[model samples]
Target: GAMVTAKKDENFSEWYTQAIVRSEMIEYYDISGCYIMRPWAFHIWEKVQRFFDDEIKKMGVENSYFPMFLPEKIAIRPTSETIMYPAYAKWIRSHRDLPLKLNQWCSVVRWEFKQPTPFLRTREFLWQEGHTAHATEEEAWELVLDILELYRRWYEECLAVPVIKGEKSEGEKFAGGKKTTTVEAFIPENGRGIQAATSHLLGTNFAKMFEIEFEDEEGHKRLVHQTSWGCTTRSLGVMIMTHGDDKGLVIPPRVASVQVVIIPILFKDENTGEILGKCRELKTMLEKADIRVRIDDRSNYTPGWKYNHWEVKGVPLRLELGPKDLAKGTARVVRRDTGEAYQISWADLAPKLLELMEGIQRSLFEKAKARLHEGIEKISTFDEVMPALNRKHLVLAPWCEDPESEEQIKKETQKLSEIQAIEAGDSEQVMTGAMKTLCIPFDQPPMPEGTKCFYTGKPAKRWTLWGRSY
Candidate 1:
């Protein structure tokens, strides 16, 4: 195995790059901001697509496709509906269509000039974008929440990364959206928050701009309310940064394409034949139990090499079967996350491995949840916010209800931005701001509150969350 040799503890970025390359997950492309996903990585993506497609379809979401290019003018218009797509609209159609719910799974291109980070920030990347149309404003609002919840589950349960579900402030909202909701996750080591996914509620703004509308049930013609949401390969980056360790990637069992790998240890004797046969039998048994299992039978690579290879690939469990195991009818199972080893009988192997996989999934989720809790803080005074911001923690503080003050706060805290406002009318007040309250901070403070306006003492009104962001 020719895996990357960097130690994860000493250098996380280098270690991650090595693991991805050594495992044959992806390769840098000739294009400046692109990478080619090799089969090993693409297989994992296929699994994710299958799982998510089935889930959304069950929720009455019908898959559909639209054009990949919209007129440049339409994309860069100065209206709410035109601000998205960054001057390159992907799709546009007439307003006569009402309640159109369509989604596309494809690659998009953005003309950005920045350093490239594989699966993190790139010009071209793979993602699934869902666009929908509704008959009324109320319907569109509900759809926004529905889609946000779906994204939250995809990240927290499927990917096993704990996230905060909330809305985006005016400046932070999608360029053309009336409202934006996001699933935010905290990366403890970096003291930064990542916007894992977003669902936007776009009012009839686009319909009016593009003339997309339909006849109502009462025979009244109206503009269609719209919504769009998406998740991207950047998600893989989030998973890596959140769970990876000094050894290598630590994948959650739920999203891991391969749950277990069996490596056969050899000896120069007929006993080697028996040991290999037992390994094959164990693979079959695990397959029958509906587990993804791989057997390393290549004689070209030594057992030590295979172990290191699988560890870098982050397989949840590895079974080592050798001559001694054949004689005793027992094998050694190594846990990838904790590197713990256990001996089990061949008959009990399948059940025990399945239990361990489930345990690993739960344990990872709990650990991420704990980190998220520790990264959040409540502050009532301006001094508390400044220190919390410097430390890069998510701060919840009251803000005066002035848009200009919000802008000033953002200027002062160059690294942070407002993520969302708290749900209106909730009984539990998480924290108080200058005047009106906002939601928990997903990034740096969007605006300043308390003490009149951080700009003018116009009587503070609410509290909101602020912090540095991804």
Candidate 2:
């Protein structure tokens, strides 16, 4: 393994690239827009899958499979109103005349002419796309919202990445969705927001296009209401931006595959066997407690090198059992999040390790919450929006909610990527006829007040949030 320092502030791009390569998490392939995930990094992905799978299953969701390729017509053709996925599309059909709830975990390919970032934008990447059909639109919409909340929890509670839940603007929505809800996270280092996950309430769009319909209890035929939601390996990229430091990757313990690594220091002298034996005993005790544990017994590397390697890999806790500590009936436990080290009794190792793991998870979430709050700023004017863009903050502003005005804003400010409509404060208190429109953070501003349109100087509808995005 190579030893390199990642100067996070000096050059963020270079430092991020170095951290990924040096930590052996991933490496860029010879082919452009692709990268290889090493075992250590891939294991973390598996952990994510397992955690989410368990959670969804508890909520009565089951996993099924879908084909990797959809016919060009199925993907490119417009349905009743919406266009299908623009690039990569997969075909999934009903099973045994049953309403299927299936998910595919696979890589998608999208050709782009721009330069590539590791996990942010790539030709090929891993994602778990969940597609399901329900008898009614209401049921389908409920499921979509449920999954969005689940994804938000995964990012915040498990991954320690705080996110904002909002609806995508018309131009920014998933191509095939009736309505798309997204979880967005702010990356402090760059001040850009990343879409962490999306859950689309597809309604009858795909079902009608694919002719997937079912008979209801009353024997009336109806097009199935459908949904698709997913979170990708790109989430790891978001995690890197949110929690990583100059030192390297900082993983929250809840989703870390290897929660604890035990390195027993031994020399060629006589006590080597005894030291190794004690380490084995400690490993078993932890394994019995249902903790993921690994002991580095390789003689080729020094203890210090092993420590650095595991730290770079972002293990939550490290237990060091050296000769002197073994004799003292104690071991040194180090926390990756804060680099705190302390001694623990060999007899109390299991309880202490469990407590430490929880602590790491909590501490990481708190730090991420602070970062998310820090990146949000309120702005009331268009000029302020540009300066906020330069600051890399998400700005809340009041705007006329016209689609054309939104497009014009995008064109006028090359830096702005999206706008979302949010109801103006106290809009609900007004009568239904006078109710204000809600703009999401990524939506275009509504038409100006009393005007027909923002672009046409028409009556405006609502307030919204507007900002640049990843």
Candidate 3:
């Protein structure tokens, strides 16, 4: 793959396009938000699916399915909201059958007209929709928090992105939801926040409408409290936006499909076969240790060419071997994120790579965490809002938490992106200009009894993370 035509910090949109497409993570045929997912990404998606599936199954959730076929009268589901409710109503007959949990990995279509952005916004996308019916409101809410935590871990642990777990504002909550919990991630490249995933407690609204109910021991029938949550392929976009660099994608070692790429450097024809032999042995040894390893021994490409090739693909680690290294029983180890080069003896290669993999994962998150901490700021007044955001920093503001205030803020946010974000501790050479409420973070401090709103000047309810979003 060719190097990106533009630098990531300078022209992120085009740089992102090259990162995913040139790396063979996706192939576009025609139209917006639709493309063939290449193996490079499909493998990553598979690993994510496996981890989530195992966790849910342990929590008593079971795999299930529903027909995708839709009738004109019934209409196609913009989401699977109504389709699952009737089934839920039929299955839960009594309290003993309470806490029914089911999940389906499927494709859903939301045909909204918008800009064509792969992985972020699309007409049709794949997601795992989870639905749970609980015997009481308490149980339903507990499940919401649990799933929300899992979503956060999926981003932080697997994708190496720092995230804030928070509650969606009333104006921003899922439609008809009693409450919604969210996992929010920031994209420094765009000076914006992205909704990585969400879990909603439906209370009895959906149950009352769908007539999902159960008989208690007292013989009284009660509505089932319900919750539903899902996250789409948009996460891949978030990963690209957050961790990708001027070189290309920087996949977290844990989630990477190929944790290490083995490039056998062959300088001459006479020694080529022997060098290839060394690479195969190393690949075998790494595979035996359960590492995802790939050896590239193409005769057409030089070692320098292969280096750039895999670097753009963002292989977590690279193993380079040659006649000298083969004789020395060492391979030059290169980290994609830091471009740091070192050496590991063949005898200790497996254990060393394992340690390095974990180290890389931790360092990537630590580096990003440092920036995220700096992006967050606490502001009390309206006058401070524009100045804070114009610098490309994320602002955590005390708010009246009303839709009216949201309107004024959005208008204010639009200006910061029009010019250079203040250079001093202010920076989105990446700002989006959307100043919408990203979330009321769970970690926010309690509003004092007499706190006033930032916009309406009413009693402040809580602090909210607001920023322009993708």
- Kindly indicate the candidate among 2 and 3 with the higher lDDT: 3
Q: 1 or 3: which has the higher TM-score?
A: 3
Kindly list the per-residue Cα lDDT of model 1 for residues 113-224, writing each as its tens digit. Answer: 3555677655556778777777778988787788777777777777788877766666667666687777777766656676777788878777676666566656666677
**TM-score head-to-head 1 vs 2, winner:** 1
Winner on lDDT between 1 and 2 is 2
**Candidate 1 minimal-lDDT segment of 10 residues:** 70-79
User: If scored against the real structure, what TM-score would every candidate get?
Assistant: 0.83, 0.81, 0.92
Order the candidates by lDDT, highest first: 3, 2, 1
The per-prediction tally of clashing pairs is 38, 30, 3
Our tally of clashes for model 1 stands at 38
lDDT of predicted model 1? 0.69
Each prediction's whole-model lDDT (CA): 0.69, 0.70, 0.81
Model 3 lDDT tens row, 278-350: 8898899999999999998788888788888888888989998878998888889999989899989999999
Model 1 vs truth, CA RMSD = 8.5
After superposing candidate 2, which stretches have Cα over 4 Å from the reference? 31-33, 58-62, 68-99, 108-114, 217-219, 267-270, 415-463
